[PDB]
Amino acid sequence: MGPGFDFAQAIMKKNTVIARTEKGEFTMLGVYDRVAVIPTHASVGEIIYINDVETRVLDACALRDLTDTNLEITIVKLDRNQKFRDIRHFLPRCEDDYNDAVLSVHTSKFPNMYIPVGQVTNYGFLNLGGTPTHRILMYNFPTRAGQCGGVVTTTGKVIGIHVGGNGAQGFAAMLLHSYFTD
Ligand SMILES: Nc1ccc(-c2ncno2)cc1
């Protein structure tokens, strides 16, 4: 409808796949080469389904901060025959607050879904499903089951992936440029 949705759509059309684990279907953001991200509660194993194709997982790392606190991001390298467009230059370098964000989801349950979530707070600590979690972004939208892995964007930046909600608020794990240096 506007330049926020334009950026979100450009990311969804080229840099997302549908990932299926034993714990469900997730929006999965491809970042560069064969490297993608997913919420850690997806419990990625040795084999994952990518757009309904059986795919070997070459590496999977559940990120934690230097206090050994959960960040709820898993970085996955996929044995896929094709690379993602490199979008690392759209990742923020530091923890921050944002105005006017969009949460975008693409699954079998929720195809081509875009949600203007508004202001995003650097919330920090969250007890997420009983697990102490850091670097959480918060938005005042009643997000539902099926939106985990959804991409949070502003104009020109990919800032997070949806990892939970409490019925009135939604929570995303920050994406930082330093997670994807090589
Ligand atoms: N986060 C939400 C909110 C509402 C819906 C919906 N309502 C009817 N059909 O879909 C879906 C996702």
Curated annotation (Swiss-Prot):
Compartment(s) of residence: Host cytoplasm
Reaction catalysis annotation: Selective cleavage of Gln-|-Gly bond in the poliovirus polyprotein. In other picornavirus reactions Glu may be substituted for Gln, and Ser or Thr for Gly
Record-annotated active site: H41, E72, C148
Residues passing through the membrane, by range: none
Superkingdom of source: Viruses
Domain Peptidase C3 residues, every copy: 2-180
Its biological purpose: Major viral protease that mediates proteolytic processing of the polyprotein. Cleaves host EIF5B, contributing to host translation shutoff. Also cleaves host PABPC1, contributing to host translation shutoff. Binds and inhibits host IFIH1/MDA5, thereby inhibiting the type-I IFN production and the establishment of the antiviral state. Cleaves host MAP3K7/TAK1, resulting in inhibition of TRAF6-triggered NF-kappa-B induction. Cleaves host TICAM1; this interaction allows the virus to disrupt host TLR3 signaling. Cleaves host IRF7, resulting in inhibition of type-I IFN production.
Subunit structure: Interacts with host IFIH1/MDA5; this interaction inhibits host IFIH1.
Protein name per Swiss-Prot or TrEMBL: Protease 3C
Portion of the parent chain present: 1549 to 1729 of 2188
